[PDB]
Amino acid sequence: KTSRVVIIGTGAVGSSYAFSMINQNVTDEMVLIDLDKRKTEGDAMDLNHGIPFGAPTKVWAGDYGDCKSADIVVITAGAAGETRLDLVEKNANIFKGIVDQVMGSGFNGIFIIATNPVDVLAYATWKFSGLPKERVIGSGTILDTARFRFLLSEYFDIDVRNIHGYIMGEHGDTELPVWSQTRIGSEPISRYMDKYKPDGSNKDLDEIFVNVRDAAYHIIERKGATHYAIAMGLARLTKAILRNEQSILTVSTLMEGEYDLDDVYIGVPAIVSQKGVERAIEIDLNDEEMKKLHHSSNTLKDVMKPIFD
Amino acid sequence: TKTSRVVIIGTGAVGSSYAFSMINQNVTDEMVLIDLDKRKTEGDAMDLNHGIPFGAPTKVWAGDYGDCKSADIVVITAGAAQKPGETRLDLVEKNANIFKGIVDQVMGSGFNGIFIIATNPVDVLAYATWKFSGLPKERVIGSGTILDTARFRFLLSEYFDIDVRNIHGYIMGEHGDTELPVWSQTRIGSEPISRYMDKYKPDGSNKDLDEIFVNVRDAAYHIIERKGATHYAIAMGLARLTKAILRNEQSILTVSTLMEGEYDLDDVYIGVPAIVSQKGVERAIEIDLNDEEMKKLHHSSNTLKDVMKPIF
Amino acid sequence: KTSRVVIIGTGAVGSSYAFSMINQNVTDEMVLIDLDKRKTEGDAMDLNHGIPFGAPTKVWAGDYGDCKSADIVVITAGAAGETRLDLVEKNANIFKGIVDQVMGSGFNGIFIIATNPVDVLAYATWKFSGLPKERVIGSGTILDTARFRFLLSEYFDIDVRNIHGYIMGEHGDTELPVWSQTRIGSEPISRYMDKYKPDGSNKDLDEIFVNVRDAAYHIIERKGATHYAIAMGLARLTKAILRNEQSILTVSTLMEGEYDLDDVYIGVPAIVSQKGVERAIEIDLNDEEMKKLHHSSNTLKDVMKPIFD
Amino acid sequence: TKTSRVVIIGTGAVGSSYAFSMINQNVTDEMVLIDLDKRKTEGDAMDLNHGIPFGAPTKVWAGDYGDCKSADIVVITAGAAQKPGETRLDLVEKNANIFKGIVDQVMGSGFNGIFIIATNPVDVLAYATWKFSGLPKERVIGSGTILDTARFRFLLSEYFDIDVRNIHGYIMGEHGDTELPVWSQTRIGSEPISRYMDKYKPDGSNKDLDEIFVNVRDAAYHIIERKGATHYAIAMGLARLTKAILRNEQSILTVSTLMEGEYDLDDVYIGVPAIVSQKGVERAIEIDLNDEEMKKLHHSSNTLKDVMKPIF
C-alpha cells in the first residue's frame, strides 16, 4: 500500500520539490531520474538523510524502469533558450524523449508537469503519453492562486484559509484574476470592503494582481532563479492526489467544452483526487473575465499549433 | 519560557474528551484539570498523563484555582444539566450560580487569559462569564455553533463528494433549537450552492438541504437517543477553537460572542461568524442576510433574552 | 491503498482507542462492532466528527463482514467477573464467539488483543483463529514499559526517548523490570547514577517499579476505570504495524523456544512491522531476571491449562 | 505573544536549505534572513515566503542585525570555504575574522538567545563564537557531529533492518577527519552490538562495521564528488538541533560544546553526547570509553587545538 513519486529532473525545481516532500512526509518512496547519472546519485545521497531525523521517505536515484509501479511522475526537466519560441521547441523535444521512456516502463499513474511553459508542456504530455486527460495535470496557476490569496490575506488581516479567489488562464502573461468570484469569508470582496476596508480602492486590488502576475520576475531579478515557491505548489498538488482529497485547485487541465473552450490545457479551478482531475469546474465569469480567458486560450493555441497537429 | 497552558474546569465526559483530543493533537504545553471531586480528578489526570512516553509531550496534572494564574485559556465544561423537575430558566439560574463561583475563583488567582465556555446553555453562560469576570468581550468566548457549522459543512461535503475545505456554510444563532442555516451565504467553492447544484447536482432537491439542516439541528438528540451521552463531537470543536487562539490564526469560526450592534442585536451572546486569534474574538463579522434569515436570527436572540431576563 | 482498522467493543477502552486514532490520524477507515447495534451506531456518530476539523479518518458502525478487507482487528470487548478465574472463563467464551465471526468474514489481517488478561486472551485468539503467531499480538507490557521509561525520564530529568528499559512477563502481578538491561542514553543505569545521580538508591528504583506495577490499581481506586492509558498504547502498536516500522515494542507474543519458554504468550521486546511480530527478541537476562520470567510464564500457564488443550 | 524567532546568517545553499526544511517542518514562528548581498537575500526571502497559502504558517523575511534583538536562536552558516592557495589555519583565521564581525553585530542588537554554528570548521568556529560573544558555554552550540551520528545510526538501521529509533551509536570528536565511532557504546535495542550480531546477524563481519564508519566519515566528500556541493543533509541536522532547543526536549544529541574537564579535555569545543534543551547545552555527557576510543578522542582534540593555537 506504499506510494511512489518519480521526479524527472534534479535541478533546482526537482530537488526543492524532493526536499519539500521529504520534510512534509507525503509519499513513501521517491525516485530521482536525470541525464547525468553520477550527479543524480549525488543528488539522491544529499536528499536521503530524512530517516534518522524522523522523516521516513525512502529516496534513491533510479531509472525509467522504476516508473512501472509509480503513482505519480513529476516532470521538472527542461532546456537551459534565448527567445520564448526557441525554449518551447527545445522543451517539447525534451518532453517527447522523457514521456516515451516513462510509457515504455509500463507506467500507468498520473503525470504532474512543472516545466514552463506549463500549459503547453502539459498538453504535450497528454499527446505524447496517450493517457486520459484526468491523469495528465500541469501545475498551472496553483502558485499564482496561492500568491493571490496570500496577498489578500495580508490586505484584510485575516487567515488565508478565509480568502477565496482564483487566478485562471495561462500560467504567464495572460493570466487573469477572477474578481467577480473573489470572496472574503462567504461575502463578495466588494461587500467585505464596504464594511471592513472602506478606504480600500480598485487601485489596491489591481496592484495586488500585478504583484501576483510579476512575482517570478521580481524573484528572478534579485536572485537569478526561483524554485522554492513552485516546490510548495507541486507538494500541495501531490498531497491532493495521494490523499484523495477531492479538493479544488487551479491546475492546468484539458478543455473539452468547458467555458466554450476546446483542445487546450489551461488553468481553471478543478477537483483533484486519486483519480487525477475529476472535473474542470465551470464558475460563472463576467463578460470581461470570459473575454480575458478566451484571449489566454487563443494565446496558448498560437504557441501550440506550430508544435502539435 | 513561552509555554502555553490550558486549564479545564470540569472533568466529566466533555472535559476529559477535550483533554484527550488536545493531548493527541499536541496543541498546548501544559494542561491542568480542576473539578469538584479531588480524588476522582487525580485519577482522571493519572489516566490522561500517558502521552509523554508515546511521543505526545503535553504535561497533564490535577490542580487547583491557583494554577489559573499563568493560564492562557480556561475552558469551563462544569455545570448541571436540566432535569425533568425544572425549567430552562431554573437550569440557567442554577448554572449561573455555579459559574459565579467558578469565575470568582479563576479571577481570584490572578488569571488574565481567555475563557472558553462549553457548558450548556452556552450562549447564556458565556454572557454570564463576561458579566462575572469583568473582562473585555474579546476574551470571553462561547463555543456557540462551532460544532453545528462543522456538521453542516461535513454533511454538505458528503452530499457534493468534495473536500470539506471547499464547503462554505454557517450555522448562526443560539446553540440549540433556534439556530439557523444561512443558505443565502452557502457556497460550494466560490459559487452559491444553488448555482453549483444547477451545474453538478441534477438529482438534488431543496428537500435534501432541509434534511441536512434538520440532521445538524437534531444531531445531539440523535446521538443521545442511541448511546445515552455525547462528548467526542464537542471535544473536537473545543480543540479547534483552542488551536485558533493559541496559534493566533485570525480565522473565521462561528462562536458565541457579545452583540453590540451587529445584526441590530444588543446585550446578548449569540453564535456568529467571528475572527478568532490570540486576542480572542477580534471581530463579530456581519454577513448580509436575507429577510427570513434576519427574522430567524432575531427570533433566536429573543429566545435567549427570555431566559436571561429574570436573572441578568 | 487505504488502511482499515476494526474495533470490537465500544466501551471505554475501544472508544478511547478510536478517539486517540482519529486525533493522531493513523488509519484511513475505522469500523466499530459491538453487541448493542443501536448503541454502537451512536458511538460511531459521536466519534465521526473529525473530518470537518481536519482529521480525515472515516468512522462507521459495521458488522463482521466489514472485517474481510481489514488490515487489523482490535479486540477490546469483554465481560462486565468477581474472581479472576471467573472473569478469564467468561472472556475466553466471549473471544471464541468474536474470533469465529471475524474468521468467518474472510479476514486475513492482524489481531491486536487489548482485553485483560491480555496474554491469556492473545493465546486464545491465536488458538481460535488458526492464524500464524506473527499476526496475533497482545498489547502485553507496552503500557508498563511506557510507564517505566516515563518515570525514569522524570527521575533523571532527561527526554523519555533517551531512557531504555523494558518490563517483561505477564501484563499483571508477575511482571518484572529488566534492570540489567536498563540504559540511560547508552550507559547502564548504575554507571549513569554513579556520575549524575550519586544520591540515588536501589530503594528509589524499586519504588519506580512498584509505581509501574500498581499504576492501574491506583487509577482505578480513584476514578473507577482506566482507558486513556491503554488507548495510547494500542495506538502506538497500531502505528508500528501500519507504518511498517520494524520497531522494538514489548508486546505479548508466542514463545517457541525463546528464553527456553514454549507454548505461552508473554510480554517480551519484539520487532513489530506490517508483518506483525517479525521476531521475539532474546535479550541477555541475569539469573534472577530469568527466574522471574519463568515464574511469570508458569503463572500464565496455570491460568491457561484449565481453558486450553 | 510567546512567538519564537530564528535568525539565519548566510543564505547560501546551507542557510537556504535550512530555512526551507524549517518552513516545511513548522518549527518556528518567525524566520529572518541576513546576508551580505541585500538584494539577493531579498529574493531568497521572497522565494522562501510561499509557505503560508500552502498551510505552512512560518513568517519569513529578509532583515538586518536589529532583528536579532528578539531572536531565540541565531544560526550562523556564513563564511569562506578553504581554497587551494591557503592552509587550514589560513581558513580558520579568515573565518574567525568573519565571525568576530558577525558576532559583534548580533550582540550589538541586544540579542540574548542561543547561537547555533554551522560554518566549517564548526568546532573551531563555535569556540570562536563563545569567546567573541561573552555568552555562557550553554548558549553557544556547534552542530558538531549531529549529522555524522545520524548517518551512523541510519546505516546501522539498514544493516540490521530495524527502526533507526532502536539504533544507539555516537560519532564523537572533531566534525571532520579525526572523528571516531564509539563502538564500545553502540547498542541495538538494549544490547551491545557484538551481542546483537552474535544472535541476529550471522553473515556479519567487523569489516562491515569499519565500512559503515568509513561511509560516515567520507559521506560529504562522496556527495561533493558527485554533485559538486552538499547542503540538504546538514540542513536536516540543523533543523533537528533547533527543534530540541525550541521544544525544550532535554534530549541527547552529539553537538559541539565546550570541554571544561569532561573526558580530561579543556579549552576546546568538540562533539560529544550532550543534553540539549531551551537552556542550550545543559550538560556534556561523559560516557565510558575504551582505551583506544579515549586515545582517538584526545588525538581529535589535539588536532583542533593545533589549528586554534596560533589565533586564540
Side-chain angles (χ1 to χ4, degrees):
Chain A
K1 293 176 183 199
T2 56
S3 57
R4 172 179 295 190
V5 176
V6 173
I7 302 164
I8 315 298
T10 58
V13 171
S15 290
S16 294
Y17 168 69
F19 203 50
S20 176
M21 292 278 292
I22 289 158
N23 285 279
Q24 285 187 35
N25 201 40
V26 175
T27 189
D28 299 303
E29 297 180 347
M30 291 204 339
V31 191
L32 306 195
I33 303 171
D34 212 345
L35 293 180
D36 184 341
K37 297 328 212 101
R38 185 167 174 74
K39 173 186 176 291
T40 313
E41 284 169 346
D43 291 322
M45 281 165 69
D46 203 22
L47 284 162
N48 195 34
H49 294 256
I51 286 152
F53 295 118
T57 302
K58 289 176 192 296
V59 184
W60 73 96
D63 57 35
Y64 283 99
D66 298 321
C67 293
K68 185 166 197 284
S69 65
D71 300 273
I72 298 165
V73 168
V74 179
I75 311 177
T76 78
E82 74 284 326
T83 65
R84 279 156 208 85
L85 205 57
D86 171 73
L87 186 69
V88 190
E89 290 184 38
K90 282 175 174 174
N91 280 349
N93 275 272
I94 287 169
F95 267 61
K96 180 60 154 66
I98 289 167
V99 172
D100 285 349
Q101 291 179 96
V102 172
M103 301 308 296
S105 74
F107 174 71
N108 196 35
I110 286 159
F111 281 107
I112 296 171
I113 298 80
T115 309
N116 288 320
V118 68
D119 305 287
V120 178
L121 299 169
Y123 186 93
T125 298
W126 174 65
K127 294 281 250 204
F128 300 159
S129 72
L131 289 177
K133 68 188 185 180
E134 286 88 353
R135 293 163 50 209
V136 177
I137 311 176
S139 46
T141 47
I142 191 165
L143 181 58
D144 313 84
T145 293
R147 287 170 168 147
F148 188 47
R149 295 190 181 202
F150 179 30
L151 291 172
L152 289 166
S153 74
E154 289 177 321
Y155 186 73
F156 292 117
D157 290 300
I158 201 178
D159 197 296
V160 68
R161 81 168 184 84
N162 295 121
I163 303 296
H164 307 285
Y166 301 127
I167 303 302
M168 288 184 71
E170 171 192 36
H171 174 67
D173 296 344
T174 65
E175 283 166 19
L176 56 136
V178 186
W179 289 115
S180 74
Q181 292 269 2
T182 295
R183 285 83 178 78
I184 313 304
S186 59
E187 292 232 297
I189 188 169
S190 75
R191 278 304 284 150
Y192 193 89
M193 288 177 76
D194 288 343
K195 300 193 259 204
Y196 301 116
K197 196 80 184 180
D199 292 339
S201 59
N202 282 0
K203 184 189 84 216
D204 295 337
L205 307 180
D206 287 343
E207 280 168 10
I208 285 170
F209 173 64
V210 167
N211 192 303
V212 175
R213 184 195 65 206
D214 297 341
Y217 175 93
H218 292 298
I219 296 163
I220 290 157
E221 80 176 333
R222 285 168 174 78
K223 71 142 185 173
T226 175
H227 42 93
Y228 292 125
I230 194 55
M232 296 300 296
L234 294 169
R236 175 70 191 94
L237 180 52
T238 303
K239 192 176 168 55
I241 299 163
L242 294 180
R243 302 287 86 77
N244 191 36
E245 290 179 2
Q246 301 185 290
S247 59
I248 302 176
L249 294 172
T250 59
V251 294
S252 185
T253 188
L254 179 77
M255 304 293 96
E256 293 209 295
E258 295 91 343
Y259 300 98
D260 280 333
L261 298 174
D262 184 61
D263 201 23
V264 59
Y265 263 71
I266 198 160
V268 305
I271 299 178
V272 177
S273 77
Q274 69 178 6
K275 295 178 183 182
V277 173
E278 295 190 357
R279 170 184 299 151
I281 300 169
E282 286 176 86
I283 65 175
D284 294 341
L285 305 172
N286 67 29
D287 290 338
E288 292 308 304
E289 288 163 344
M290 183 65 86
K291 180 167 86 181
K292 289 180 172 74
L293 180 70
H294 280 250
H295 173 65
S296 191
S297 176
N298 284 340
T299 298
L300 283 166
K301 287 186 174 186
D302 285 346
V303 179
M304 287 156 60
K305 287 189 257 212
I307 300 161
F308 313 101
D309 183 33
Chain B
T1 61
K2 303 182 175 192
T3 56
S4 60
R5 172 181 297 191
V6 178
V7 174
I8 303 163
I9 318 288
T11 55
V14 168
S16 282
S17 292
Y18 169 66
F20 202 51
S21 172
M22 291 283 289
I23 289 159
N24 283 103
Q25 285 186 216
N26 205 38
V27 175
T28 193
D29 298 307
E30 290 175 356
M31 196 134 241
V32 186
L33 312 182
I34 304 173
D35 211 349
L36 175 63
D37 186 339
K38 285 273 171 284
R39 188 160 161 88
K40 177 191 172 286
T41 304
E42 284 168 359
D44 291 327
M46 287 165 165
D47 204 21
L48 284 158
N49 193 32
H50 285 79
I52 286 154
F54 293 118
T58 303
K59 299 180 192 311
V60 183
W61 71 99
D64 59 44
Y65 285 102
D67 302 313
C68 294
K69 184 180 180 116
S70 65
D72 301 86
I73 299 170
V74 172
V75 183
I76 309 180
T77 76
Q82 192 182 336
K83 58 176 74 180
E86 70 191 358
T87 70
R88 284 177 291 156
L89 187 129
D90 287 332
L91 184 69
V92 166
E93 283 198 12
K94 182 186 278 188
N95 279 353
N97 181 72
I98 293 159
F99 268 60
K100 172 68 166 185
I102 289 173
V103 171
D104 289 347
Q105 288 183 273
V106 175
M107 299 307 290
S109 75
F111 174 71
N112 198 27
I114 288 164
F115 282 105
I116 290 168
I117 300 84
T119 311
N120 288 318
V122 67
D123 308 285
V124 174
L125 296 172
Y127 184 95
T129 300
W130 172 65
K131 284 304 201 182
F132 300 154
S133 67
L135 293 174
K137 69 183 179 185
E138 288 86 355
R139 290 166 53 203
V140 180
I141 308 169
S143 52
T145 49
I146 191 168
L147 180 61
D148 313 86
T149 295
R151 287 173 167 147
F152 191 48
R153 296 188 181 201
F154 182 31
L155 292 171
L156 289 164
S157 79
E158 295 195 323
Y159 188 68
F160 292 113
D161 208 27
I162 195 172
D163 196 296
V164 70
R165 291 172 296 180
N166 296 117
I167 304 293
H168 309 287
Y170 300 128
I171 303 302
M172 288 183 69
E174 178 195 35
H175 172 72
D177 293 348
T178 66
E179 71 191 28
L180 56 135
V182 186
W183 290 116
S184 80
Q185 291 272 358
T186 301
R187 327 293 185 193
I188 314 295
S190 59
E191 293 223 302
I193 185 169
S194 63
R195 280 303 280 149
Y196 191 90
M197 293 188 69
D198 284 339
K199 299 175 186 173
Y200 303 115
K201 190 88 181 158
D203 68 328
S205 172
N206 59 32
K207 297 177 198 143
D208 298 341
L209 303 183
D210 284 345
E211 186 163 28
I212 282 167
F213 174 66
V214 167
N215 283 326
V216 172
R217 184 193 66 201
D218 296 342
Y221 177 84
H222 291 305
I223 296 165
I224 293 161
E225 160 188 58
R226 282 169 175 79
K227 71 134 165 175
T230 175
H231 40 92
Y232 294 118
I234 195 61
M236 298 298 288
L238 293 168
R240 172 78 190 91
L241 175 54
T242 301
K243 193 182 298 78
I245 296 165
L246 293 181
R247 301 288 86 75
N248 190 37
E249 293 178 5
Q250 287 186 299
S251 70
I252 299 171
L253 294 170
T254 58
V255 291
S256 187
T257 187
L258 179 68
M259 306 289 103
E260 290 194 304
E262 299 90 346
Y263 299 103
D264 293 331
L265 304 174
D266 289 284
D267 247 322
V268 65
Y269 263 67
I270 204 164
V272 302
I275 302 298
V276 181
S277 74
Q278 219 162 213
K279 297 176 161 64
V281 169
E282 292 192 9
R283 177 147 75 210
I285 299 166
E286 287 176 86
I287 67 180
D288 290 347
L289 304 179
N290 71 30
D291 287 344
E292 289 312 303
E293 289 162 347
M294 182 66 81
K295 177 176 179 182
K296 287 183 167 98
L297 177 67
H298 280 240
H299 173 70
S300 190
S301 176
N302 292 335
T303 299
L304 284 166
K305 289 184 179 193
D306 286 348
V307 301
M308 289 162 73
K309 266 159 185 163
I311 305 94
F312 302 94
Chain C
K1 293 176 183 199
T2 56
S3 57
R4 172 179 295 190
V5 176
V6 173
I7 302 164
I8 315 298
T10 58
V13 171
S15 290
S16 294
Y17 168 69
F19 203 50
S20 176
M21 292 278 292
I22 289 158
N23 285 279
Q24 285 187 35
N25 201 40
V26 175
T27 189
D28 299 303
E29 297 180 347
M30 291 204 339
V31 191
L32 306 195
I33 303 171
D34 212 345
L35 293 180
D36 184 341
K37 297 328 212 101
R38 185 167 174 74
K39 173 186 176 291
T40 313
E41 284 169 346
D43 291 322
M45 281 165 69
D46 203 22
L47 284 162
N48 195 34
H49 294 256
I51 286 152
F53 295 118
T57 302
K58 289 176 192 296
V59 184
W60 73 96
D63 57 35
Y64 283 99
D66 298 321
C67 293
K68 185 166 197 284
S69 65
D71 300 273
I72 298 165
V73 168
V74 179
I75 311 177
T76 78
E82 74 284 326
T83 65
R84 279 156 208 85
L85 205 57
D86 171 73
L87 186 69
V88 190
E89 290 184 38
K90 282 175 174 174
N91 280 349
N93 275 272
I94 287 169
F95 267 61
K96 180 60 154 66
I98 289 167
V99 172
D100 285 349
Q101 291 179 96
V102 172
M103 301 308 296
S105 74
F107 174 71
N108 196 35
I110 286 159
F111 281 107
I112 296 171
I113 298 80
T115 309
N116 288 320
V118 68
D119 305 287
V120 178
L121 299 169
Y123 186 93
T125 298
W126 174 65
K127 294 281 250 204
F128 300 159
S129 72
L131 289 177
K133 68 188 185 180
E134 286 88 353
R135 293 163 50 209
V136 177
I137 311 176
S139 46
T141 47
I142 191 165
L143 181 58
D144 313 84
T145 293
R147 287 170 168 147
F148 188 47
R149 295 190 181 202
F150 179 30
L151 291 172
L152 289 166
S153 74
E154 289 177 321
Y155 186 73
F156 292 117
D157 290 300
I158 201 178
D159 197 296
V160 68
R161 81 168 184 84
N162 295 121
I163 303 296
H164 307 285
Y166 301 127
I167 303 302
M168 288 184 71
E170 171 192 36
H171 174 67
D173 296 344
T174 65
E175 283 166 19
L176 56 136
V178 186
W179 289 115
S180 74
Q181 292 269 2
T182 295
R183 285 83 178 78
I184 313 304
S186 59
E187 292 232 297
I189 188 169
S190 75
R191 278 304 284 150
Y192 193 89
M193 288 177 76
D194 288 343
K195 300 193 259 204
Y196 301 116
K197 196 80 184 180
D199 292 339
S201 59
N202 282 0
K203 184 189 84 216
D204 295 337
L205 307 180
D206 287 343
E207 280 168 10
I208 285 170
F209 173 64
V210 167
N211 192 303
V212 175
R213 184 195 65 206
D214 297 341
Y217 175 93
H218 292 298
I219 296 163
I220 290 157
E221 80 176 333
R222 285 168 174 78
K223 71 142 185 173
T226 175
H227 42 93
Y228 292 125
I230 194 55
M232 296 300 296
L234 294 169
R236 175 70 191 94
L237 180 52
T238 303
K239 192 176 168 55
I241 299 163
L242 294 180
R243 302 287 86 77
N244 191 36
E245 290 179 2
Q246 301 185 290
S247 59
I248 302 176
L249 294 172
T250 59
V251 294
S252 185
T253 188
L254 179 77
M255 304 293 96
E256 293 209 295
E258 295 91 343
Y259 300 98
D260 280 333
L261 298 174
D262 184 61
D263 201 23
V264 59
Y265 263 71
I266 198 160
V268 305
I271 299 178
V272 177
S273 77
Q274 69 178 6
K275 295 178 183 182
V277 173
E278 295 190 357
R279 170 184 299 151
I281 300 169
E282 286 176 86
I283 65 175
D284 294 341
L285 305 172
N286 67 29
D287 290 338
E288 292 308 304
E289 288 163 344
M290 183 65 86
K291 180 167 86 181
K292 289 180 172 74
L293 180 70
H294 280 250
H295 173 65
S296 191
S297 176
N298 284 340
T299 298
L300 283 166
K301 287 186 174 186
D302 285 346
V303 179
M304 287 156 60
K305 287 189 257 212
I307 300 161
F308 313 101
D309 183 33
Chain D
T1 61
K2 303 182 175 192
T3 56
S4 60
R5 172 181 297 191
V6 178
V7 174
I8 303 163
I9 318 288
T11 55
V14 168
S16 282
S17 292
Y18 169 66
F20 202 51
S21 172
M22 291 283 289
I23 289 159
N24 283 103
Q25 285 186 216
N26 205 38
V27 175
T28 193
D29 298 307
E30 290 175 356
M31 196 134 241
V32 186
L33 312 182
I34 304 173
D35 211 349
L36 175 63
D37 186 339
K38 285 273 171 284
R39 188 160 161 88
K40 177 191 172 286
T41 304
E42 284 168 359
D44 291 327
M46 287 165 165
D47 204 21
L48 284 158
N49 193 32
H50 285 79
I52 286 154
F54 293 118
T58 303
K59 299 180 192 311
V60 183
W61 71 99
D64 59 44
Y65 285 102
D67 302 313
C68 294
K69 184 180 180 116
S70 65
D72 301 86
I73 299 170
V74 172
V75 183
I76 309 180
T77 76
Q82 192 182 336
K83 58 176 74 180
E86 70 191 358
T87 70
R88 284 177 291 156
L89 187 129
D90 287 332
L91 184 69
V92 166
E93 283 198 12
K94 182 186 278 188
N95 279 353
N97 181 72
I98 293 159
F99 268 60
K100 172 68 166 185
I102 289 173
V103 171
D104 289 347
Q105 288 183 273
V106 175
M107 299 307 290
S109 75
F111 174 71
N112 198 27
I114 288 164
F115 282 105
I116 290 168
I117 300 84
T119 311
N120 288 318
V122 67
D123 308 285
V124 174
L125 296 172
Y127 184 95
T129 300
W130 172 65
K131 284 304 201 182
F132 300 154
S133 67
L135 293 174
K137 69 183 179 185
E138 288 86 355
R139 290 166 53 203
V140 180
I141 308 169
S143 52
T145 49
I146 191 168
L147 180 61
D148 313 86
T149 295
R151 287 173 167 147
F152 191 48
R153 296 188 181 201
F154 182 31
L155 292 171
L156 289 164
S157 79
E158 295 195 323
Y159 188 68
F160 292 113
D161 208 27
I162 195 172
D163 196 296
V164 70
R165 291 172 296 180
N166 296 117
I167 304 293
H168 309 287
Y170 300 128
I171 303 302
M172 288 183 69
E174 178 195 35
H175 172 72
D177 293 348
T178 66
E179 71 191 28
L180 56 135
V182 186
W183 290 116
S184 80
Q185 291 272 358
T186 301
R187 327 293 185 193
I188 314 295
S190 59
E191 293 223 302
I193 185 169
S194 63
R195 280 303 280 149
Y196 191 90
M197 293 188 69
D198 284 339
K199 299 175 186 173
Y200 303 115
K201 190 88 181 158
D203 68 328
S205 172
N206 59 32
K207 297 177 198 143
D208 298 341
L209 303 183
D210 284 345
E211 186 163 28
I212 282 167
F213 174 66
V214 167
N215 283 326
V216 172
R217 184 193 66 201
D218 296 342
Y221 177 84
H222 291 305
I223 296 165
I224 293 161
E225 160 188 58
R226 282 169 175 79
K227 71 134 165 175
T230 175
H231 40 92
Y232 294 118
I234 195 61
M236 298 298 288
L238 293 168
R240 172 78 190 91
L241 175 54
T242 301
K243 193 182 298 78
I245 296 165
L246 293 181
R247 301 288 86 75
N248 190 37
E249 293 178 5
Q250 287 186 299
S251 70
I252 299 171
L253 294 170
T254 58
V255 291
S256 187
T257 187
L258 179 68
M259 306 289 103
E260 290 194 304
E262 299 90 346
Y263 299 103
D264 293 331
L265 304 174
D266 289 284
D267 247 322
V268 65
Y269 263 67
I270 204 164
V272 302
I275 302 298
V276 181
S277 74
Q278 219 162 213
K279 297 176 161 64
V281 169
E282 292 192 9
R283 177 147 75 210
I285 299 166
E286 287 176 86
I287 67 180
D288 290 347
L289 304 179
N290 71 30
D291 287 344
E292 289 312 303
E293 289 162 347
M294 182 66 81
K295 177 176 179 182
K296 287 183 167 98
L297 177 67
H298 280 240
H299 173 70
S300 190
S301 176
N302 292 335
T303 299
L304 284 166
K305 289 184 179 193
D306 286 348
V307 301
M308 289 162 73
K309 266 159 185 163
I311 305 94
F312 302 94

